Design a protein around this ligand. Structure first.
Ligand SMILES: Cc1cc2nc3c(=O)[nH]c(=O)nc-3n(C[C@H](O)[C@H](O)[C@H](O)COP(=O)(O)O)c2cc1C
Length: 110
């Protein structure tokens, strides 16, 4: 989908914290860099987020593999939205994962 957001997480640190987010990520979610750089993206989850979809992502990250999931997420103001998320590992020439990138699409309106 054409409208989307983009983030980079640092896989060389144990909890894959965010190191970069696009202008649209901040604007869509309602958070700014001074609130979410250095943090794992799970802050977007909440009461209704499907733990089985969360587990798929967790498992893909541990295996250094790409994954696509649909997750209920929440803006800073607590309002929900449907996030079609695709995460992709970025490797060094030795095959180790350095970064994960994420593309989010708000698919609430279909
Ligand atoms: C690059 C990247 C982007 C991510 N973007 C989101 C996101 O937009 N929304 C979300 O709920 N989780 C997102 N995650 C998933 C969480 O950061 C975390 O990996 C997931 O919740 C599973 O780990 P946990 O069980 O320790 O929370 C993203 C992860 C990575 C690596």
């Amino acid at each position: 989908g054409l409208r989307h957001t983009f983030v980079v997480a640092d896989a060389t640190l144990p909890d894959c914290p965010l190191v970069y987010a696009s202008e649209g990520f901040y604007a869509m979610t309602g958070y700014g860099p001074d609130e979410v750089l250095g943090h794992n993206c799970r802050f977007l989850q909440g009461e209704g987020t499907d733990p089985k979809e969360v587990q798929k992502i967790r498992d893909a990250i541990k295996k250094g593999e790409a994954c696509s999931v649909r997750l209920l997420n929440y803006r800073k103001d607590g309002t929900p939205f449907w996030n079609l998320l695709t995460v992709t590992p970025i490797k060094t020439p030795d095959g180790r994962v350095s970064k994960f990138v994420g593309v989010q699409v708000d698919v609430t309106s279909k």
